[PDB]
Amino acid sequence: DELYRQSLEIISRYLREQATGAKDTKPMGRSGATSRKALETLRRVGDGVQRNHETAFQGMLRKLDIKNEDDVKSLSRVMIHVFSDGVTNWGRIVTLISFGAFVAKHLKTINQESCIEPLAESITDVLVRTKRDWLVKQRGWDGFVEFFHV
Ligand SMILES: Cc1n[nH]c(C)c1-c1cccc2c(CCCOc3cccc4ccccc34)c(C(=O)O)[nH]c12
């Protein structure tokens, strides 16, 4: 599943980098050129989403109890419901991933750096399960990068 693999690469890298501060230097798989600009776009736009929605993000983070990987999987119930309701557009997707980064940074501060990879898998699973046809119609990550271009 190449859309899943590329999406997990992009989402995983962004959440880990936000949480640790460090860029992951390891090589990308294929479509790495698109994955790179998608990461550039996340750093640029995603960082501002977290600032601009800080109150709402902190409020949702308070409502989440994440003690183990079973609780990461339980979150996916909230993620599917809130993300499935409403209009589909690239703003929804960048919000989904930016709140992922906001949660991963918290998970690192509480010594749960380990839940970050499962969190990224859940986010990617929800994104592709709910929006695969729309994502393909929009040229996937090439569409994401074009949308936020400039
Ligand atoms: C119109 C609407 N209704 N509901 C939702 C969700 C959206 C929506 C639609 C599109 C984007 C967003 C965003 C991201 C922040 C602003 O986006 C941009 C940032 C930088 C350059 C851009 C160049 C072109 C277009 C957007 C850009 C948000 C958000 O952060 O809250 N919401 C968006």
Ligand SMILES: Cc1n[nH]c(C)c1-c1cccc2c(CCCOc3cccc4ccccc34)c(C(=O)O)[nH]c12
């Ligand atoms: C409550 C509220 N008020 N104003 C805004 C902005 C928010 C808000 C706060 C947080 C996330 C969102 C989303 C994305 C869909 C739901 O994503 C998640 C829900 C639960 C756990 C998660 C753990 C990791 C990653 C994603 C998660 C939206 C949206 O889709 O429009 N809005 C959100």
